[PDB]
Each structure stands twice: as C-alpha cells, then as structure tokens.
C-alpha cells in the first residue's frame, strides 16, 4: 500500500522459503527495513525475487532460526 513494503522471499534453500516483507523506506532515506516475521512458505519460487540469508542481519537470521530452523551447528561456536 502506497509503495512501501514489498514481499520477496529469502533463499533459505533448506526446502522452504520465507516470505519477507522488505520495507523500502525512501521516506526514511533508502534503507530497507526487514520485517520481523519468519512466515515460511512451502513454495520455492522461481519468478519471485529471492534474497540469500547472507544479506540478512543477525537478528533477522536469529528469528528465522528460532522459528522454523532451530539449527545450531557452527554458530556462536
């Protein structure tokens, strides 16, 4: 609505993708504020734009992790 947030998917690549709302805040400046939700879709999109986890901040990845992933292999150690 009014061009502020777009929905893209994060390339979790783990069999599911998370539908992330990227708040493009041109009003802010040009900073893309990432949504706090980790809503995953079963759908692995080809047409939609996927952004890899590598681009996502530590807290966003943490939310992804604590919700659906729960992976702790070599992180924090």
What is the rounded CA–CA span in Å between residue 15 and residue 30? 31
Q: What is the DSSP string of 59-73?
A: HHHHHHIIIII---S
Ordered by start, the domain boundaries in the chain are 1-77
Q: Which residues of 39-74 are buried (b: 16+ CB within 10 A; e: fewer)?
A: ebeeeeeeeeebbebeebeeebbebbbeeebeeeee
Which CATH architecture is the domain 1-77 placed in?
2-Layer Sandwich (3.30)
Q: How was this structure determined?
A: NMR
Q: Find the helix or strand (DSSP H, E) in which 58 lies.
A: helix 58-64
The answer for residues whose C-beta is within 8 angstroms of residue 69's C-beta and 6 or more apart is: 12, 14
Q: What spatial distance separates the first Cα and last Cα of the chain, rounded to whole Å?
A: 42
Instruction: Give Cα 39 distance to the centre of its chain.
Output: 9
């Amino acid at each position: 609505m009014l061009k502020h947030g777009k929905y893209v998917y994060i390339d979790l690549n783990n069999g599911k993708y998370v539908k992330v709302r990227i708040l493009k805040s041109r009003d802010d400046n040009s900073v893309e504020k990432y949504v706090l939700t980790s809503h995953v879709s079963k759908n692995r999109p080809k047409n939609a734009i996927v952004i890899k986890m590598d681009n996502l901040p530590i807290e966003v990845k943490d939310k992804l992790t604590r919700f659906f992933l729960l992976e702790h292999h070599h992180h924090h150690h």
